[PDB]
Amino acid sequence: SLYQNANSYVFVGSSRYSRKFEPEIATRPKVRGQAGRMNYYWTLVEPGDKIT
């Protein structure tokens, strides 16, 4: 409904970070009205490097 794609994937990349995510779908309890979860991430990009 929101991404139009079947089973999606996400990749973020640098030199101090490298990981892939497979979204998990389940009946989680409601917190602020949304049963879904948002998981937040951060990374420091060293000077001259590129993030992707």
Total residues in contact with its own copies, by rule CB under 8 A: 13
Q: Would you say 30 or 42 has its CB closer to its own copies?
A: 30
Q: In angstroms, what is the minimal distance from the CB of 13 to its own copies?
A: 6
50 near its own copies, rule: CB under 8 A: yes
Based on the number of CB atoms within 10 Å of its own CB, is 43 exposed (0-12), middle (13-18) or buried (19 or more)?
middle
Q: Which residue has the tokens 């389940």?
A: 26
Q: 17 Cβ partners below 8 Å, 6+ apart?
A: 43
Residues lying near its own copies in the complex (CB under 8 A): 9, 11, 13, 18, 20, 24, 26-29, 37, 50, 52
